[PDB]
Amino acid sequence: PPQVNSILKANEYSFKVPEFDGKNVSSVLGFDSNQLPANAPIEDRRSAATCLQTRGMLLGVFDGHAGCACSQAVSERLFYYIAVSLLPHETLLEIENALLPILQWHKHPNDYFSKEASKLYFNSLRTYWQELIDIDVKEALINAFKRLDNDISLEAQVGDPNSFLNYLVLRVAFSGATACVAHVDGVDLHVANTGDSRAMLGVQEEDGSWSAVTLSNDHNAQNEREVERLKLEHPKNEAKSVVKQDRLLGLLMPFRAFGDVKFKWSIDLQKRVIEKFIPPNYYTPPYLTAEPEVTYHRLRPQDKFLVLATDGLWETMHRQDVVRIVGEYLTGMQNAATHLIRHAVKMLSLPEELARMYRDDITIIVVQFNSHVVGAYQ
Numbered sequence: 001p002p003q004v005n006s007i008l009k010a011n012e013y014s015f016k017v018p019e020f021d022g023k024n025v026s027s028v029l030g031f032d033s034n035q036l037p038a039n040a041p042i043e044d045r046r047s048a049a050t051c052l053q054t055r056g057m058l059l060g061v062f063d064g065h066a067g068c069a070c071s072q073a074v075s076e077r078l079f080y081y082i083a084v085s086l087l088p089h090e091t092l093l094e095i096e097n098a099l100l101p102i103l104q105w106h107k108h109p110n111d112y113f114s115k116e117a118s119k120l121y122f123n124s125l126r127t128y129w130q131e132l133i134d135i136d137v138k139e140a141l142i143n144a145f146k147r148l149d150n151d152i153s154l155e156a157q158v159g160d161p162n163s164f165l166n167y168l169v170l171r172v173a174f175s176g177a178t179a180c181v182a183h184v185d186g187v188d189l190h191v192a193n194t195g196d197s198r199a200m201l202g203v204q205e206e207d208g209s210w211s212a213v214t215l216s217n218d219h220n221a222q223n224e225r226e227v228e229r230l231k232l233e234h235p236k237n238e239a240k241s242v243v244k245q246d247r248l249l250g251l252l253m254p255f256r257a258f259g260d261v262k263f264k265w266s267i268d269l270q271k272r273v274i275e276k277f278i279p280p281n282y283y284t285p286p287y288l289t290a291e292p293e294v295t296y297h298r299l300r301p302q303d304k305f306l307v308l309a310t311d312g313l314w315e316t317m318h319r320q321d322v323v324r325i326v327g328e329y330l331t332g333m334q335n336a337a338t339h340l341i342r343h344a345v346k347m348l349s350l351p352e353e354l355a356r357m358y359r360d361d362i363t364i365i366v367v368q369f370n371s372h373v374v375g376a377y378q
């Protein structure tokens with residue numbers, strides 16, 4: 001390069017699930033992830049963690065808008081809500097007393113946790129697990145998303161003594177974030193999706209060709225069921241106004257998300273909290289949820305990898321090109337997501353604050369499955 005590899009690869013991570021007793025024993029071999037920014041501070045986020053008290057692995061991509069406070073928040077909190085929602089009763093009790101390790105994060109050095117907000121965050125989680133004390137995975141993911149998005153709403157209202165923290169809850173509730181998350185326990189894949197990010201299964205066909213299977217539907221204006229669902233959630237007189245110019249109330253591209261309290265709160269609460277300023281065409285809120293659509297897939301020996309990615313990838317390529325490219329990469333004919341980012345974008349359309357003229361933030365996780373272990377459950 002004149003230095004192109006240095007950039008593509010600046011953020012590229014990749015994790016191997018450790019061998020036990022000399023053998024690859026998991027249905028997951030490992031994953032690769034990378035990000036390429038188009039925005040100042042990048043607005044996408046990526047996360048990956050292993051449940052320590054329950055078996056599964058969590059992976060996630062989050063596409064922030066109107067700042068990165070909310071993608072940052074959910075990129076670090078959501079997995080704890082999901083994890084704690086999977087804990088059996090007896091285990092919850094343990095923790096309330098004590099302390100037991102919950103998640104092992106697989107993060108690149110550029111990913112980070114919020115130092116200053118840690119106490120507050122633990123407190124809401126704790127509050128949450130206390131109430132759970134007083135197990136369907138699908139129904140866990142759902143309540144976890146909802147509960148996170150709701151706590152985000154409460155924390156914005158409650159504010160904080162610390163002027164900086166008080167500011168943070170607000171910046172978090174007023175910016176928004178998509179969320180597309182995989183949970184894998186053995187042969188059981190669940191994909192919880194909220195927004196226009198996307199999980200895609202790469203299937204190798206018996207002739208060795210590559211096929212793409214969708215595990216999520218983009219929650220936007222192309223999505224019929226979604227436009228139908230928005231209308232049904234409001235009086236008939238709104239059917240014309242709910243979605244316009246392909247946007248939620250003429251504004252938001254993604255039709256589901258965290259934060260974005262502007263599209264959820266009553267006008268009077270937006271006013272009282274105003275201590276941003278503008279509401280939409282806005283009669284019967286809330287208009288927007290963080291509640292995810294959840295898909296289950298039982299893994300097969302054909303099922304070779306899962307690509308989770310924000311729309312910066314997807315707007316660029318056909319689903320089939322993504323799965324083919326990764327398909328060929330993994331199979332001989334480095335990091336799969338660096339590769340996809342390279343095709344997505346010899347050619348130096350990169351430099352400067354004119355990038356988001358030509359591209360979005362791109363964040364990609366490629367999980368690779370262990371066909372022998374998966375096939376061993378067949």
Ligand SMILES: [Mn+2]
Nearest residue numbers: 043063064065
């Ligand atoms: Mn974004």
Ligand SMILES: [Mn+2]
Nearest residue numbers: 063311312360
């Ligand atoms: Mn995007």
